[PDB]
Design a protein around this motif. Structure first.
Motif, PDB file in Angstrom:
ATOM      1  N   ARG A   1      92.940 -29.819  62.333  1.00 41.78           N
ATOM      2  CA  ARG A   1      92.811 -29.310  63.436  1.00 41.78           C
ATOM      3  C   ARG A   1      91.765 -30.130  64.322  1.00 41.78           C
ATOM      4  O   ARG A   1      92.029 -30.158  65.649  1.00 41.78           O
ATOM      5  CB  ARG A   1      92.179 -27.906  63.432  1.00 41.78           C
ATOM      6  N   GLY A   2      90.855 -30.807  63.560  1.00 42.13           N
ATOM      7  CA  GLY A   2      89.839 -31.820  64.415  1.00 42.13           C
ATOM      8  C   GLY A   2      88.371 -31.224  64.200  1.00 42.13           C
ATOM      9  O   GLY A   2      87.576 -32.037  64.458  1.00 42.13           O
ATOM     10  N   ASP A   3      88.224 -29.840  63.683  1.00 46.57           N
ATOM     11  CA  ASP A   3      86.851 -29.523  63.249  1.00 46.57           C
ATOM     12  C   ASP A   3      86.551 -29.075  61.710  1.00 46.57           C
ATOM     13  O   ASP A   3      87.634 -28.978  61.063  1.00 46.57           O
ATOM     14  CB  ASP A   3      86.522 -28.209  64.296  1.00 46.57           C
ATOM     15  N   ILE A   4      85.522 -28.848  61.273  1.00 44.21           N
ATOM     16  CA  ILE A   4      84.948 -28.649  60.245  1.00 44.21           C
ATOM     17  C   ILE A   4      84.649 -26.908  60.302  1.00 44.21           C
ATOM     18  O   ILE A   4      83.740 -26.752  61.278  1.00 44.21           O
ATOM     19  CB  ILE A   4      83.932 -29.533  59.444  1.00 44.21           C
ATOM     20  N   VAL A   5      84.963 -26.102  59.145  1.00 45.53           N
ATOM     21  CA  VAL A   5      84.623 -24.779  59.503  1.00 45.53           C
ATOM     22  C   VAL A   5      83.693 -24.156  58.407  1.00 45.53           C
ATOM     23  O   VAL A   5      83.767 -24.686  57.300  1.00 45.53           O
ATOM     24  CB  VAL A   5      85.784 -23.976  59.720  1.00 45.53           C
ATOM     25  N   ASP A   6      82.831 -23.393  58.642  1.00 45.77           N
ATOM     26  CA  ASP A   6      81.878 -22.707  57.617  1.00 45.77           C
ATOM     27  C   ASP A   6      82.784 -21.541  57.237  1.00 45.77           C
ATOM     28  O   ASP A   6      83.250 -20.767  57.861  1.00 45.77           O
ATOM     29  CB  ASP A   6      80.617 -22.199  58.062  1.00 45.77           C
ATOM     30  N   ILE A   7      82.822 -21.378  55.918  1.00 43.26           N
ATOM     31  CA  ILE A   7      83.436 -20.237  55.418  1.00 43.26           C
ATOM     32  C   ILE A   7      82.627 -19.319  54.462  1.00 43.26           C
ATOM     33  O   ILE A   7      83.303 -18.574  54.000  1.00 43.26           O
ATOM     34  CB  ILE A   7      84.692 -20.790  54.489  1.00 43.26           C
ATOM     35  N   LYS A   8      81.445 -19.591  54.461  1.00 44.27           N
ATOM     36  CA  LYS A   8      80.539 -18.638  53.936  1.00 44.27           C
ATOM     37  C   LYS A   8      80.948 -17.332  54.520  1.00 44.27           C
ATOM     38  O   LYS A   8      81.126 -17.139  55.606  1.00 44.27           O
ATOM     39  CB  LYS A   8      78.853 -18.840  54.104  1.00 44.27           C
ATOM     40  N   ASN A   9      80.930 -16.097  53.501  1.00 41.23           N
ATOM     41  CA  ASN A   9      81.262 -14.925  53.584  1.00 41.23           C
ATOM     42  C   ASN A   9      82.694 -14.572  54.376  1.00 41.23           C
ATOM     43  O   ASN A   9      82.710 -13.663  54.832  1.00 41.23           O
ATOM     44  CB  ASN A   9      79.921 -14.088  54.277  1.00 41.23           C
ATOM     45  N   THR A  10      83.765 -15.305  54.090  1.00 39.71           N
ATOM     46  CA  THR A  10      85.013 -15.044  54.666  1.00 39.71           C
ATOM     47  C   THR A  10      85.963 -15.101  53.287  1.00 39.71           C
ATOM     48  O   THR A  10      85.476 -14.896  52.204  1.00 39.71           O
ATOM     49  CB  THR A  10      85.511 -16.219  55.400  1.00 39.71           C
ATOM     50  N   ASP A  11      87.185 -14.768  53.504  1.00 37.01           N
ATOM     51  CA  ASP A  11      87.986 -14.627  52.489  1.00 37.01           C
ATOM     52  C   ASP A  11      88.195 -15.717  51.410  1.00 37.01           C
ATOM     53  O   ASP A  11      88.707 -15.948  50.492  1.00 37.01           O
ATOM     54  CB  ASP A  11      89.378 -14.164  52.871  1.00 37.01           C
ATOM     55  N   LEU A  12      87.687 -17.091  52.237  1.00 35.05           N
ATOM     56  CA  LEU A  12      87.740 -18.217  51.348  1.00 35.05           C
ATOM     57  C   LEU A  12      86.543 -18.681  50.893  1.00 35.05           C
ATOM     58  O   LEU A  12      86.425 -19.960  50.556  1.00 35.05           O
ATOM     59  CB  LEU A  12      88.216 -19.271  52.147  1.00 35.05           C
ATOM     60  N   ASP A  13      85.392 -17.713  50.669  1.00 29.85           N
ATOM     61  CA  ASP A  13      84.248 -18.128  50.081  1.00 29.85           C
ATOM     62  C   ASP A  13      84.469 -17.928  48.790  1.00 29.85           C
ATOM     63  O   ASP A  13      84.556 -16.876  48.252  1.00 29.85           O
ATOM     64  CB  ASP A  13      83.309 -17.348  50.546  1.00 29.85           C
ATOM     65  N   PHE A  14      84.346 -19.015  47.896  1.00 29.05           N
ATOM     66  CA  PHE A  14      84.657 -18.696  46.340  1.00 29.05           C
ATOM     67  C   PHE A  14      83.520 -19.269  45.857  1.00 29.05           C
ATOM     68  O   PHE A  14      83.348 -19.340  44.633  1.00 29.05           O
ATOM     69  CB  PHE A  14      85.918 -19.418  45.934  1.00 29.05           C
ATOM     70  N   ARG A  15      82.355 -19.135  46.353  1.00 26.23           N
ATOM     71  CA  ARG A  15      81.184 -19.787  45.929  1.00 26.23           C
ATOM     72  C   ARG A  15      80.843 -18.861  44.688  1.00 26.23           C
ATOM     73  O   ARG A  15      80.178 -19.143  43.770  1.00 26.23           O
ATOM     74  CB  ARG A  15      80.058 -19.808  46.991  1.00 26.23           C
ATOM     75  N   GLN A  16      81.247 -17.717  44.705  1.00 23.14           N
ATOM     76  CA  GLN A  16      80.938 -16.759  43.560  1.00 23.14           C
ATOM     77  C   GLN A  16      82.360 -16.307  43.108  1.00 23.14           C
ATOM     78  O   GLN A  16      83.225 -16.000  44.166  1.00 23.14           O
ATOM     79  CB  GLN A  16      80.429 -15.217  43.886  1.00 23.14           C
ATOM     80  N   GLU A  17      82.698 -16.489  41.943  1.00 26.24           N
ATOM     81  CA  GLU A  17      84.049 -16.017  41.463  1.00 26.24           C
ATOM     82  C   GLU A  17      84.464 -15.140  41.916  1.00 26.24           C
ATOM     83  O   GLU A  17      84.069 -13.941  42.048  1.00 26.24           O
ATOM     84  CB  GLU A  17      84.139 -16.137  39.796  1.00 26.24           C
ATOM     85  N   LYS A  18      86.016 -15.177  42.236  1.00 26.76           N
ATOM     86  CA  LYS A  18      86.852 -14.223  43.030  1.00 26.76           C
ATOM     87  C   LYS A  18      88.419 -14.199  42.611  1.00 26.76           C
ATOM     88  O   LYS A  18      88.637 -15.260  42.459  1.00 26.76           O
ATOM     89  CB  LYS A  18      86.473 -13.690  44.407  1.00 26.76           C
ATOM     90  N   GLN A  19      88.941 -13.140  42.681  1.00 26.51           N
ATOM     91  CA  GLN A  19      90.445 -13.497  42.355  1.00 26.51           C
ATOM     92  C   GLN A  19      91.040 -13.750  43.565  1.00 26.51           C
ATOM     93  O   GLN A  19      90.733 -13.838  44.679  1.00 26.51           O
ATOM     94  CB  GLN A  19      90.982 -11.835  42.054  1.00 26.51           C
ATOM     95  N   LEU A  20      92.303 -14.621  43.191  1.00 25.31           N
ATOM     96  CA  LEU A  20      92.931 -15.287  44.247  1.00 25.31           C
ATOM     97  C   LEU A  20      93.713 -14.283  45.270  1.00 25.31           C
ATOM     98  O   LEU A  20      94.008 -14.434  46.616  1.00 25.31           O
ATOM     99  CB  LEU A  20      93.998 -16.320  43.669  1.00 25.31           C
ATOM    100  N   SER A  21      94.082 -13.265  44.575  1.00 30.73           N
ATOM    101  CA  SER A  21      94.696 -12.241  45.582  1.00 30.73           C
ATOM    102  C   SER A  21      94.102 -11.985  46.705  1.00 30.73           C
ATOM    103  O   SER A  21      94.513 -11.461  47.905  1.00 30.73           O
ATOM    104  CB  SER A  21      95.139 -11.018  44.738  1.00 30.73           C
ATOM    105  N   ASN A  22      92.725 -12.243  46.635  1.00 24.28           N
ATOM    106  CA  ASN A  22      91.969 -11.999  47.903  1.00 24.28           C
ATOM    107  C   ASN A  22      92.203 -12.726  48.992  1.00 24.28           C
ATOM    108  O   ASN A  22      92.980 -12.388  49.990  1.00 24.28           O
ATOM    109  CB  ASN A  22      90.459 -12.254  47.681  1.00 24.28           C
TER     110      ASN A  22
END
Ligand SMILES: OC[C@H]1O[C@@H](O)[C@H](O)[C@@H](O)[C@@H]1O
Ligand SMILES: OC[C@H]1O[C@@H](O)[C@H](O)[C@@H](O)[C@@H]1O
Ligand code: NA
Lengths: 346, 339
Positions: free
Chosen positions: B205-226
């Protein structure tokens, strides 16, 4: 029978034996012939493992291209456009450039037809590889039959207008020993003309010369020593033979060349217009073949192709290949026993 | 133990079994990993012969390059000059262009070190191949040890300034069956940013996005279904995940990612700055792996490399390789079983 085993570096050795007990072997490293024996004697030069090829000399028995020979300054003209190819011998492009097709592992498939066995090697030359427009889908099929005929069939298709004129770099030495010169072999070759080289750089001089009745005339069989001993400028220049010979009559039907030693003969058939003959003029280099130091003149090639230098001598041919057009070439080496009387001494 | 066998079309299959009884196998076709199994279960996706890879999908488990990912319009600037690479996906150059290094037979040598066995694959990319300046002598060493560590070390040298950013394309599936979605695995990933895709062409796209606290934050383990059930336009765009994640801390000593299913877990370590995650968003394709029809989301990659898109977003890094410079990269996948 067909047998396969690892040959080193990840390459394979495919060994065939026909009904007459003659054996021949190939490797996918460079779609190449490794050995050919009759009664336990080697008919050609080769090594015992893949690594040797890579460390000693990678041309022997190889499929070389996309263009065989030297192209002056690496310059070709393709559909009105000039292209510079990889230059690996000074400003010259020799045998397709560095790290060419003879150094690659080709994929392959074996087809057993009973009286004949085929080994079809395939490789893709990507667009731009070594400066050649492509991509070029190539295949080389080596087959051996019950009649002792070893045949090489080339096929190629390019996505873009390019140039193509590959050849097989086998070296024969009927002595079965690299340390023995082939000057004791008898040679017959259906060619009245040859292509001289300009100088030590080995590019073509620009002219075609008639060799009838010279030490280079082999229309009628004569021993190779006649040539080796010659003081003709051209022979002195390369310390042996290293030239394209233009076949007088074309067609796969004619025996264009015959190499004999005692009771064994190898016959050469091809649909190509010339045969490049190089007699291992290595001097004292002494490359080891099966632990035997190879001697100057310890081998001879019959590389059938369109003569090199067509860039400067258009009369030689056109090696262009149009996009979508199917290239095809066929060369056959047939082995015979007691074809003629050849009882000499050196 | 080491076993070598014919894998088809003249390629070889090299299988290494360590002291723990785990088995990993590679093929010189594409310097690639073919299988990885424990207690008879496959942990990754793979085929049973060379032909399959050529006929079905040539990417799985392969070394891809010289540049991994998509390059907009096939264009790169080298020494201020524009060069056009082979375009094999529309105007884009995806994974090196058509008939790239993953479809070639590489030479190799096996080195047995006891606790560790290494298989070094080598290939020369000729100058001008697919538009890339060279020649580039490349080598990929895959090694496997008694600690269940599978490591990939790359090395390259070019005669001319060029670009170089290869990756390993393995797909994991701890279900041991392609017909089963990875939505049940848990993922942990030490990345707080990602690179959005422009659209269906998948160029950045051209930019860099912060994903903290979104469905893509995997900083803490989570199931992929999410992530799979997310309504994020990015997830929706590709129908799963197909993006570069930017690692928060660089360095080979940090576990960058961890994929887990039950007692079995895979940890990822790398010296690269990004991990490209693609969840096999193939819809109904249904490619067959070991006679099993693959399902949408039937696999996941962890491709470590410099993020694709640096041609437009320089912050991502620089993939140039100057003549004479030695390139090196290392990625490790460690297998663990809880007791
Ligand atoms: O192998 C090296 C030799 O290759 C032959 O094909 C060429 O004609 C020779 O001139 C060259 O020295
Ligand atoms: O193998 C094909 C796949 O390769 C991945 O590395 C890409 O990110 C996917 O978009 C692509 O469909
Ligand atoms: Na093999």
């Amino acid at each position: 029978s067909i047998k396969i085993r690892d040959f080193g570096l990840g390459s394979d050795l495919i060994s065939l034996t026909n009904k007459a007990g003659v054996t021949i072997s190939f490797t996918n490293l460079g779609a190449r012939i490794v050995d050919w024996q009759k009664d336990g004697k080697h008919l050609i030069l080769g090594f015992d493992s893949a690594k040797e090829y890579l460390e000693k000399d990678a041309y022997p028995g190889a499929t070389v291209g996309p263009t065989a020979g030297r192209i002056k300054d690496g310059l070709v003209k393709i559909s009105g456009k000039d292209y510079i190819l990889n230059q690996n011998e000074g400003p010259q492009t020799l045998h397709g450039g560095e790290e060419s097709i003879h150094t690659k592992l080709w994929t392959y498939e074996v087809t057993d037809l009973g009286a004949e066995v085929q080994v079809k090697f395939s490789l893709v030359s990507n667009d731009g590889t070594n400066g050649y427009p492509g991509k070029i889908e190539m295949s080389v099929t080596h087959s051996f039959d019950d009649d002792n005929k070893w045949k090489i069939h080339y096929e190629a298709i390019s996505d873009k207008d390019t140039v193509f004129n590959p050849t097989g770099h086998v070296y024969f030495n009927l002595n079965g020993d690299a340390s023995e010169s082939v000057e004791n072999h008898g040679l017959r070759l259906a060619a009245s003309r040859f292509v001289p080289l300009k100088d030590q750089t080995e590019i073509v001089r620009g002219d075609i010369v008639d060799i009838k009745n010279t030490d280079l005339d082999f229309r009628q069989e004569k021993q190779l020593s006649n040539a080796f001993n010659s003081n003709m400028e051209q022979v002195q220049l390369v310390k042996g033979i290293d030239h394209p010979f233009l076949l007088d009559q074309l067609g796969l039907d004619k025996e264009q060349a015959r190499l004999t030693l005692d009771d064994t003969s190898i016959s050469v058939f091809t649909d190509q217009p010339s045969i490049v003959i190089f007699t291992a003029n290595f001097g004292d280099l002494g490359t080891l073949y099966h632990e035997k130091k190879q001697v100057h003149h310890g081998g001879i090639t019959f590389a059938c192709q369109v003569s090199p230098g067509s860039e400067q001598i258009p009369e030689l041919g056109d090696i262009s290949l149009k996009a979508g057009e199917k290239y095809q070439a066929t060369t056959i080496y047939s082995l015979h026993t007691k074809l003629e009387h050849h009882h000499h001494h050196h």
